[PDB]
Amino acid sequence: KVFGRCELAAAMKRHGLDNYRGYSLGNWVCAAKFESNFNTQATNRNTDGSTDYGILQINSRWWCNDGRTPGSRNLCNIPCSALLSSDITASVNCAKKIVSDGNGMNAWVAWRNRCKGTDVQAWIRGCRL
Numbered sequence: 001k002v003f004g005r006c007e008l009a010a011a012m013k014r015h016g017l018d019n020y021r022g023y024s025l026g027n028w029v030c031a032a033k034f035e036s037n038f039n040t041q042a043t044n045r046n047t048d049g050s051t052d053y054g055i056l057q058i059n060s061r062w063w064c065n066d067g068r069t070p071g072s073r074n075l076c077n078i079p080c081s082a083l084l085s086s087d088i089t090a091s092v093n094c095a096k097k098i099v100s101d102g103n104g105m106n107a108w109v110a111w112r113n114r115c116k117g118t119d120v121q122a123w124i125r126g127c128r129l
Ligand SMILES: [Cl-]
Pocket: 024, 025, 026, 027, 120, 121, 122, 124
């Protein structure tokens, strides 16, 4: 599923992400735009052989099982394929664990480089929430 901007914002707010660990909703929408272009089916292979999955590009080296990243962990206890669903519940729940792990949203490279320090409220401007 390719989300609209305000549609995704409402779903994330309906999933508890607004101000989660201090990150306003616009941070999460900005991250999803530049990680996946709001596409739940996005995948990208990394040099080390791990793969990133879904609307927030969660990496199989630590967070999910895809059967093809030897020596990796599955800290969200899910198959990586579950992160590609049109229902974003599994991605949101796993993102809550990532952002709690000490490094905040710096875990998402595109957030650090394209969202951090910008007017992220602009990403939810005009949405009914
Ligand atoms: Cl915001």
